[PDB]
Nucleic acid binder design. Structure first.
Ligand SMILES: C[C@H](CCC(=O)NCCC[N+](C)(C)C[C@H](O)CS(=O)(=O)O)[C@H]1CC[C@H]2[C@@H]3[C@H](O)C[C@@H]4C[C@H](O)CC[C@]4(C)[C@H]3C[C@H](O)[C@]12C
Ligand SMILES: C[C@H](CCC(=O)NCCC[N+](C)(C)C[C@H](O)CS(=O)(=O)O)[C@H]1CC[C@H]2[C@@H]3[C@H](O)C[C@@H]4C[C@H](O)CC[C@]4(C)[C@H]3C[C@H](O)[C@]12C
Ligand code: 118
Ligand SMILES: [Mg+2]
Ligand SMILES: [Mg+2]
Lengths: 68, 1339, 502
RNA sequence: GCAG
């Protein structure tokens, strides 16, 4: 369901800003997770361009200049 | 009539004759507080009951005691207006006379060694003003009545909403007034459990074993026995035949004869009657009839002493054999027949692990105080402190009444603590409800909900403060200083006063009063609230408590309620609703004796109302009392049905009995949908008072009541003649009938001029009477805010046309003419108070001064030499009102600023401009300045000027009251002196002060002269001691807050005129925002040239079905059509015969109205005065649900020579050609609501930023910044607006280095951002790293 | 330490000095008030204002009316920039003083700096992405934002006290996103279904419905017209009614298979009003699109047809022209609601007396025990529901064709020109379900627990509800209002869960 | 307490 799928993202920042912050943050902490900031909530939280729309070109440039 | 009601008589269209006039609308507040503070020798109410509830206070050892003899309220230090000015509570000191009795050391009684009796001050209790308000910290607050669940026992269920089997599970709940809740409930296995304070549940027989009942006594209480007695052989069984109702016997029944029912055949009531006709008392059943039967006694051996079977032990044939061997020919056994007598108690006697009372007390201890080892002496004290000590459990008088009423006892009074009997009876009634012979209580029934009001909540808080002080005085009385201390040395007034202080100031129910108009006040006082302390929460309050119940009829308004998250929780009391002495709402009905409706009213509560059958108010009846019909619509059980005319028991007392006071003012309420009626009722209370109050052309008849029963007006206390009248006072010369002996006989009414309401409107009283005019007891002498000649008037009578006009009244907009602005119709005065506080800072004190740095002498032109603005100054936004400078240090100029000041030499100033300025956009007149100086700070020239003006005014007011009163005394002395020994040629020349001592022939008249001279001497003694009190209250220094040196409050008066954006409305829920202020010549106009004042949208009527607003238009055109007829007759100057004839034809119109205005009894002066007051439209009265029919509206339309369809043809004002269809034109009553666009418009480019996270601050008071919430961020993510979003996050809001770069980039003309990280993300990272979690940013 | 990190998780919360629990480190970052939701996912924003919205129907689709007093403050750095750039101020402090004094040149500078600079208008709740839209500002004198009418349906805005928040796109990228992604002339279709969301409503659709109807013997009937211009000349001269059925020569263009427009010309049988309305129809559209009585659905389909055939740019001009002509001809009609417009059928009292006879028969049959209270109640409900539908049919049949007028002497019935019926039938406001309660009976009500009361409200709002029927009415009205109040929090939480899963 |  949409709640258990929102909290089972690969991003602890999305899932931690949705709800149940304590569970998401403790699980991510003991697992030592790494949030690669791929969605839109992680890029709104850190004040970056969202990877969708007019900020899609910039993120593609970012993933063509750092993977190579 | 009156003399104030035949000035302008409202034409009443109501037809039902009224038998009960509307009561005092503020009886709830005034009666509650009067119960609280009045002396009560019986000791049941208020402070006396609260004192007897705590006192006497024995010591721990009983050697001494503190008893209470009496209390007494002091006089208030400041009157109400001084309390509103100085910002202090209006309260009275509670001085209580206590007595410390010291007994002796060795005495058979503890005889009195000493008594020390003295009067100790404990606290100040706030005082209800004479309008039902409290002035608490200078603001007027209303303590709202609460609607809470009555104490008592409440049986309820959950209707199969557990365990998916659809099994209804019952639960009783004992709720006390104070103390621990006690619930009993059933589980899905039919086992009775118990909870105490909603913590985990125990088997219910544990609370039965904590009371000293054994298992045998428990089985005795909850059951009856089928006695098996062993006669000669074959297990004879005693038979009570009704125990055999409705079963299938496993065996045929043979008693001395006939076989009644064979094996496996079902038993019906014929078989029971047959067995009792045979008088069967004995059976011999198969032996396996005892396979499953539970013994009901403790059956032990006499031979071997072995306990064969104790109680609650299921029997078997082997047990039967070993039990019969001991000479036990008597076997008592439980009778549990399925579906009518369950095993629930005998089933729970197996689920509880407890065997004895001490183990049960231990188990209750373990549930209550877990983890702590239970000892006997504490487990058996916890239980008798739970429900059985008056110190900790009070079921109260309402609790005991509802308790015994629920258990069908005949005594309504008793002890406030529980008993064995009460708990056992509650369990019995719960078991009865399980066995289908009971019914659960409806928890939203208004017999189960109770009005707890101001004088009861205030007493509860006072008694909490009293127990706080009495624990300390018990702690102090058991010390050994006991001989030399007085009772006021052990009483601390600060806990007691702090309890009532936090109640009156900080409770949820102690609310800032609505003071828009009189309706807002008088409906804030009649307000019921489910919320509050001890009530619901608006989030957790369900759907069912928010609904209108059938017992709300006549007790609580169905329509006047809020519309947002607390709907159905804030209620309004209906017009006639009272409260019981217990607090349950009750409403009056007329008794129907034999089919004749008596005029004897009975106040029925919600439970009594459901027994009788009760006619409607619309039920017709002839003048004999009899119902002219024979099948009457009535309500009998909350169900509504038709009944005969001889089943009818009561009748509703009025047609407006069902609605509140605010909904009683909507004409044609019966035509509005209930949603639009709710909105109209709620938007009548937001209507601001305009410059000139305008009566409603179409009222309902409650306008006089609302205007008088709210204290906004000045009503004559005794009748008389207006001796003097003036814009600020009215001096009434009382009739000789109504004045007391030895009295001046003069009433002074000091009107209130241009004061601030809580909503910053102005509350200003204008004298309604003119000079030399006779007034009576009860007439309105002064129109307050929003009243016109004693009638509540909240808006103006605008001429509306219903037509779509060129897009300008699209979607609830309103197109206003310009003549509504020229004529200052909706122009309202708003008064703001602005305070400039000169404080003491650590770098020196702030000073109020006119030598302000960096400000030219053009801005300081309105300030006087004290630095304060001049009274009467027309200021605008940005003007300095109170010049104040702050000392500052830490200057630290930049290198460039250092060079700039070494070039020009203009040095920096050591003070910083901290002035008070008019807020932006505000433009008004300073009308008042008040200066408060801390004692010890020297007053400037202006504070001394203001003090000298106040002393001049105090002396002038008190000398003028003495002049008026002494002139009245001398007129009364002159009247008495000429009643015998006439001096009419002598009296007017002798010096008047010798009339005080002129000895006349004493028949009895010299006694009256003695009393009149005593009156004059007392007035001369009293004026001086009032003036000296006023001088010492004026010149005394102020108790300011700590740190502040002085406070300058400046009062601006802003006339706000109507303008596009201002939200207007009507009485029918037809709100709307003004879209355009249209020229006069653009408005649509009729054939006579009269343009329309307001063009409304007709599409707003049919979907939201408030049809009433159309009828009020059609009637409002009829009424004006009468007015502009009378107006014509006053310009041609017709004789008063023609005017009298036409006005009589207008007041006699209507089909069987209740009023008769026969103005042949009117003089010609009275007819011309009435015809002058009716020349602006004749006011109509359309009582709610009884109003003017459509045919009466058409008949009055025909009398004014208007078209009976209500629709005239209009021409376009712009093109001069006719609109192709007739247009509804009439006069609606438009209200200007307090949502003015001047107060809503806000804008901010840059401003002040929040402290922890660096985002903009919140509201337009702090220069705001709008919240770009989560949903708007989604809306920008849904477009691809990544850059707009990234600037909403970084540089508009949080980026501290990016916001200033963006500012200087915009100023440079370079619209480019350099976004960083939001500061709040850094705050978050630091707040997660402080949790011991290393959150990082991977480069 | 456990109370510092997460207060109240183990056992009892620590309350300090208020008997109100202490806000721990975990409560700073968690919940509806934590950093994540209060401060990171949405925040307070500079260059933003707020005011009451009001109509302004003169506007074009892409512009709002922004008060000068709000625009002077939201655009303050822009004005300081242009004030120094144009040499009117020597220093940004001099410019600050100039805009504080509101000198007459800062109003010309302000007209310069808002010129092609869009603003975002936002109404909360921003339920869907058309809750924020960019408009070009037009400086007005009031204090209320003037919102073009066609966009209101997208914002869910009525002018009964609604307020909207203004935001300023600062950079060039944000200005071009407001121009290119969010401008209201780009959002004419709904992102949910494809249907037009910038669509005419209550006043416009009533004006266009009244214009495109036909009366039987209307003034100037049957004449032959050279074109739509002659129809407009006749109607403005008063020589032909707006509903006169006439014969007009209409030239219309079809899109050829290649993409170009080809003309055709034919005498159509129209009315004068459909001819007048043809003058605003863009070219590539058939004449059959206006040659009918245009309700709400016909106008929404007309706009959709223009969008699919001709594209966005002619549709925007078309929609504004529709709004102006609908507002104008709604004003010309004077379509007003009077109390005689709610015509109650005269067979209502007879229908209700027959239904009362039937229920009394069922009651005295229940006294005869042949029916249980259950089927007695069920049959009484069904023989009141049949009465309610008979009343509603009699009302609507009496209402919808009550115009019986003459052609060459002989009477003939037509669709009604009743105002209530024109409003219900246009789709402007209301439905037959509300005309039912105005003029029929308002029917059976339900108790608060859902079980419907066995005797209906036999009265309607043109007559009075008596006090008991009104009480019964409030039973369900407060249930609907409380449902509305407590289901917005139930829907907003679903929306939040869906946005966070997707 | 209220506004939409
Ligand atoms: C005298 C009067 C009627 C007899 C009885 C019946 C109901 C009783 C009140 C209620 O119990 C509520 C409340 C309980 C507090 O404990 C004490 C105050 C209150 C107001 C009581 C006062 C008094 O006792 C009342 C009015
Ligand atoms: C007509 C009436 C009775 C004769 C006389 C007796 C007392 C007189 C008032 C007092 O003097 C106080 C005051 C003085 C001001 O100067 C003018 C107003 C006041 C109210 C006077 C009005 C008037 O003159 C009064 C009422
Ligand atoms: C705490 C407890 C209950 C609710 Sb709610 C509610 C919400 C907004 C306005 C009024 C009420 C509620 C609970 C019980 C009965 C009735 C209402 C609520 C719960 C789930 C989804 C949406 C709202 C919210 C917070
Ligand atoms: Mg709205
Ligand atoms: Mg609140």
């Amino acid at each position: 369901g949409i709640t258990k799928a929102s909290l089972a993202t690969e991003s602890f920042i999305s899932a931690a800003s949705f709800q149940e912050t304590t569970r998401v943050l403790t699980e991510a902490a003991v697992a030592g997770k790494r949030d690669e900031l791929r969605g839109l909530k992680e890029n709104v939280i850190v004040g970056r361009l969202i990877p969708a729309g007019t900020g899609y070109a910039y993120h593609q440039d970012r993933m063509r200049r750092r993977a190579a | 009539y009156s003399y104030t009601e035949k000035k302008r008589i409202r034409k009443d269209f109501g037809k039902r004759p009224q038998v009960l006039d509307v009561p005092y609308l503020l009886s709830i507040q005034l009666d509650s507080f009067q119960k609280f503070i009045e002396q009560d020798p019986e000791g049941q109410y208020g402070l006396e009951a609260a004192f007897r509830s705590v006192f006497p206070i024995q010591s721990y050892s009983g050697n001494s005691e503190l008893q209470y003899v009496s209390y007494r309220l002091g006089e208030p230090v400041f009157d109400v207006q001084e309390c509103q000015i100085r910002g202090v509570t209006y309260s009275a000191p509670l001085r209580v006379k206590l007595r410390l009795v010291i007994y002796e050391r060795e005495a058979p009684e503890g005889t009195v060694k000493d008594i020390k009796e003295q009067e100790v001050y404990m606290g100040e209790i706030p005082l209800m003003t004479d309008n039902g308000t409290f002035v608490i910290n200078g603001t007027e607050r209303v303590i709202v009545s609460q609607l809470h669940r009555s104490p008592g026992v409440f049986f309820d269920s959950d209707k199969g909403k557990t365990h998916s089997s659809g099994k209804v599970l019952y639960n009783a709940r004992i709720i006390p007034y104070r103390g621990s809740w006690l619930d009993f409930e059933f589980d899905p296995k039919d086992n009775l459990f118990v909870r105490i304070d909603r913590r985990r549940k125990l088997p219910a027989t544990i609370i039965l074993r904590a009371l000293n009942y054994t298992t045998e006594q428990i089985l005795d209480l909850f059951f009856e026995k089928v006695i098996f007695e062993i006669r000669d052989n074959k297990l004879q069984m005693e038979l009570v035949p009704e125990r055999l109702r409705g079963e299938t016997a496993s065996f045929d029944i043979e008693a001395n004869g006939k076989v009644y029912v064979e094996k496996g055949r079902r038993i019906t009531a014929r078989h029971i009657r047959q067995l009792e006709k045979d008088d069967v008392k004995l059976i011999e059943v198969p032996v396996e009839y005892i396979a499953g039967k539970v013994v009901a006694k403790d059956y032990i051996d006499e031979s071997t002493g072995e306990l064969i079977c104790a109680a609650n032990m299921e029997l078997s044939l082997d047990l039967l054999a070993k039990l019969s061997q001991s000479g036990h020919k008597r076997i008592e056994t439980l009778f549990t027949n399925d579906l009518d007598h369950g095993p629930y108690i005998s089933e729970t006697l197996r689920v509880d692990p407890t065997n004895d009372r001490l183990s049960a007390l231990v188990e209750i201890y373990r549930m209550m105080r877990p983890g702590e080892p239970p000892t006997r002496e504490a487990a058996e004290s916890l239980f008798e402190n739970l429900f059985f000590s008056e110190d900790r459990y009070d079921l109260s008088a309402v609790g005991r009444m509802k308790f015994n009423r629920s258990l069908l006892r005949e005594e309504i009074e008793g002890s406030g603590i529980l008993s064995k009997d009460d708990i056992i009876d509650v369990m019995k009634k719960l078991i009865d409800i399980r066995n289908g012979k009971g019914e659960v209580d409806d928890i939203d029934h208004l017999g189960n909900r109770r009005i707890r009001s101001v004088g009861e909540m205030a007493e509860n808080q006072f008694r909490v403060g009293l127990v706080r002080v009495e624990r300390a005085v018990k702690e102090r009385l058991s010390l050994g200083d006991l001989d030399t201390l007085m009772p006021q040395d052990m009483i601390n007034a600060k806990p007691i006063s702090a309890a009532v202080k936090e109640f009156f100031g900080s409770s949820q129910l102690s609310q800032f009063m609505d003071q828009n108009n009189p309706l807002s006040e008088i409906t804030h006082k009649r307000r019921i609230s489910a919320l509050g302390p001890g009530g619901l929460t608006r989030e957790r309050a369900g759907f069912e408590v928010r609904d209108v119940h059938p017992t709300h009829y006549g007790r609580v308004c169905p329509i006047e309620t809020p519309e947002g998250p607390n709907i159905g929780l804030i209620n309004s009391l209906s017009v006639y609703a009272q409260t019981n002495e217990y607090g349950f709402l009750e409403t009056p009905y007329r008794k129907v004796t034999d089919g004749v409706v008596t005029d004897e009213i009975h106040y029925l509560s919600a439970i009594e109302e459901g027994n009788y059958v009760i006619a409607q108010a619309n039920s017709n009846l002839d003048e004999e009392g009899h119902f002219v019909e024979d099948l009457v619509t009535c309500r009998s059980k909350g169900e509504s049905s038709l009944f005969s005319r001889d089943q009818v028991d009561y009748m509703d007392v009025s047609t407006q009995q069902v609605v509140s006071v605010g909904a009683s003012l909507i004409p044609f309420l019966e035509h509005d949908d209930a949603n639009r009626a709710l909105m109209g009722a709620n938007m009548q209370r937001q209507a601001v008072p305009t410059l000139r109050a305008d009566k409603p052309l179409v009222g309902t008849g409650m306008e006089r009541a609302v205007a008088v029963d709210s204290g906004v007006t000045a009503v004559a206390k005794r009748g008389g003649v207006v001796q003097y009248v003036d814009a600020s006072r009215i001096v009434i010369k009382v009739n000789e009938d109504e004045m007391y002996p030895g009295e001046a006989g003069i009433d002074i009414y000091n009107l209130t001029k241009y004061t601030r309401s809580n909503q910053n409107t102005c509350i200003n009283q204008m004298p309604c009477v003119s000079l030399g005019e006779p007034v009576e007891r009860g007439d309105v002498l002064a129109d307050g805010p929003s009243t016109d000649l004693g009638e509540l008037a909240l808006g103006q009578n605008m001429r509306v046309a219903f037509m779509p006009w060129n897009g300008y009244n699209f979607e609830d907009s309103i197109l206003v003419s310009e003549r509504v602005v020229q004529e200052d119709r909706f122009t309202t005065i708003h008064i703001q108070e602005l305070a400039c506080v000169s404080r003491d800072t650590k770098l020196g004190p702030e000073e109020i001064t006119a030598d302000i740095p960096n400000v030219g002498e053009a801005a300081l032109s309105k300030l006087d030499e004290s630095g304060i603005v001049y009274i009467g100054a027309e200021v605008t936004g940005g003007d300095i009102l109170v010049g104040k400078v702050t000392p500052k240090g830490e200057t630290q100029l930049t290198p460039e600023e250092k060079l700039l000041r070494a070039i020009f030499g203009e040095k920096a100033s050591d003070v910083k401009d901290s002035s008070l300025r008019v807020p932006n956009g505000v433009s008004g007149t300073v009308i008042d300045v008040q200066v408060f100086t801390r004692d010890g700070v020297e007053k400037d020239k202006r504070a001394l000027e203001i003090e000298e003006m106040q002393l001049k005014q105090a002396k002038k007011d008190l000398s003028e009251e003495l002049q008026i009163l002494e002139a009245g005394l001398f007129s009364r002395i002159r009247a008495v002196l000429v009643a015998g020994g006439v001096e009419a040629e002598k009296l007017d020349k002798l010096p008047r002060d010798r009339w005080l001592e002129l000895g006349l022939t004493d028949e009895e008249k010299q006694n009256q002269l003695e009393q009149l001279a005593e009156q004059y001497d007392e007035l001369k003694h009293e004026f001086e001691k009032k003036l000296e009190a006023k001088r010492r209250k004026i010149t005394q220094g102020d108790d300011l807050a700590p740190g502040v040196l002085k406070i300058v409050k400046v009062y601006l008066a802003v006339k706000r005129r109507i303008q596009p954006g201002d939200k207007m409305a009507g009485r029918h829920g037809n709100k709307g925002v003004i879209s355009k202020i249209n020229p006069i010549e653009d408005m649509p106009y009729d054939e006579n040239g009269t343009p329309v004042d307001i063009v409304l949208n007709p599409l707003g009527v049919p979907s939201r079905m408030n049809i009433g607003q159309i009828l009020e238009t059609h009637l409002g055109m009829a009424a004006k059509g009468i007015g502009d007829k009378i107006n014509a007759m006053l310009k041609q100057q017709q004789e008063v015969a023609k005017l009298r004839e036409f006005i009589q034809r207008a007041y006699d119109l209507g089909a069987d109205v209740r009023q008769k205005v026969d103005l042949s009894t009117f003089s010609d002066e009275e007819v011309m005065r009435l015809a002058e007051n009716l020349r602006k439209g004749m006011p109509i009265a359309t009582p709610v649900f009884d109003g003017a029919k459509e045919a009466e509206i058409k008949e009055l339309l025909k009398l004014g020579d208007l078209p009976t369809s209500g629709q005239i043809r209009l021409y376009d004002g712009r093109t001069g050609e006719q609109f192709e269809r007739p247009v509804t034109v009439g006069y609606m009553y438009m209200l200007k609501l307090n949502h003015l666009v001047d107060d809503k418009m806000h804008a901010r480019s840059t401003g002040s930023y929040s402290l922890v996270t660096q985002q903009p601050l919140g509201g337009k008071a702090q220069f705001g910044g709008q919240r770009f919430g989560e949903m708007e961020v989604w809306a920008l993510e849904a477009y691809g607006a990544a850059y707009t979003l990234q600037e909403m996050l970084t540089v508009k809001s949080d980026d501290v280095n990016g916001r200033t770069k963006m500012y200087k980039n915009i100023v440079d003309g370079n619209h480019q951002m350099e976004p960083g990280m939001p500061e709040s993300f850094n705050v978050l990272l630091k707040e997660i790293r402080s949790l011991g979690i290393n959150i990082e940013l991977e480069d | 330490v456990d109370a510092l990190l997460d207060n109240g998780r183990r056992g009892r919360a620590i309350t300090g000095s208020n008997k109100r629990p202490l806000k721990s480190l975990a409560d700073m970052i968690k919940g509806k008030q934590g950093r994540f939701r209060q401060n990171l996912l949405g925040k307070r924003v500079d260059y933003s204002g707020r005011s009451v919205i009001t109509v302004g129907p003169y506007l074009r689709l892409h512009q709002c009316g922004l008060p000068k007093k709000m625009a002077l403050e939201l655009f303050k750095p822009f004005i300081y920039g242009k004030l120094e750039l144009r040499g009117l101020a020597t220093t940004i402090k001099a410019a600050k003083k100039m805009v504080e004094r509101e000198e007459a040149v800062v109003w010309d500078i302000l007209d310069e700096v808002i010129r092609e600079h869009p603003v975002l208008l936002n109404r909360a709740p921003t339920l869907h992405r058309l809750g924020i839209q960019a408009f070009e500002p037009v400086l007005i004198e009031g204090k209320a934002i003037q919102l073009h009418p066609l966009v209101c349906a997208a914002y869910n805005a009525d002018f009964d006290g609604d307020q909207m928040a203004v935001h300023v796109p600062l950079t060039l990228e944000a200005q071009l996103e407001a121009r290119a992604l969010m401008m209201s002339t780009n959002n004419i279709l709904s992102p949910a279904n494809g249907e037009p969301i910038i669509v005419p409503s209550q006043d416009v659709v009533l004006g266009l419905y009244y214009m495109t109807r036909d009366c039987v013997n209307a003034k100037g009937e049957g004449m032959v017209l050279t074109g739509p211009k002659e129809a407009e000349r006749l109607y403005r001269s008063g020589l032909a009614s707006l509903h006169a059925r006439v014969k007009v020569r209409i030239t219309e263009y079809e899109k050829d298979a290649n993409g170009e427009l080809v003309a055709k010309t034919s005498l159509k049988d129209t009315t004068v009003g459909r001819a007048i309305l043809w003058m605003i129809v863009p070219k590539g559209l058939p004449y059959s699109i206006v040659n009918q009585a245009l309700g709400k659905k016909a106008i929404s389909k007309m706009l959709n047809t223009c969008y699919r055939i001709l594209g966005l740019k002619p549709t925007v001009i078309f929609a504004d022209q529709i709004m102006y002509t609908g507002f104008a001809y709604a004003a010309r009609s004077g379509a007003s609601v009077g109390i005689d417009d709610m015509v109650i059928p005269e067979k209502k009292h007879e229908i209700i007396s027959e239904a009362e006879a039937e229920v009394a028969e069922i009651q005295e049959q229940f006294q005869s025990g042949l029916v249980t209270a259950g089927e007695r109640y069920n049959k009484v409900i069904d023989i009141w529901a049949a009465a309610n539908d008979r009343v509603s049919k009699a009302m609507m049949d009496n209402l919808q064709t009550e115009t019986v007028i003459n052609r060459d002497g002989q009477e003939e019935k037509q669709v009604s020109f009743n105002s209530i019926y024109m409003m219900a039938d246009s789709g402007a406001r209301g439905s037959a379900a509300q005309i039912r309660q105005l003029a029929g009976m308002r029917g059976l009500m339900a108790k608060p627990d859902g079980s419907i009361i066995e005797t209906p409200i036999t009265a309607n709002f043109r007559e009075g509800l008596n006090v008991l029927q009104y009480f019964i009415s409030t039973h369900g009205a407060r249930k609907g209002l409380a449902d509305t109040a407590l289901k917005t929090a139930n829907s907003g939480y679903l929306t939040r869960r869906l946005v966070d899963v997707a």
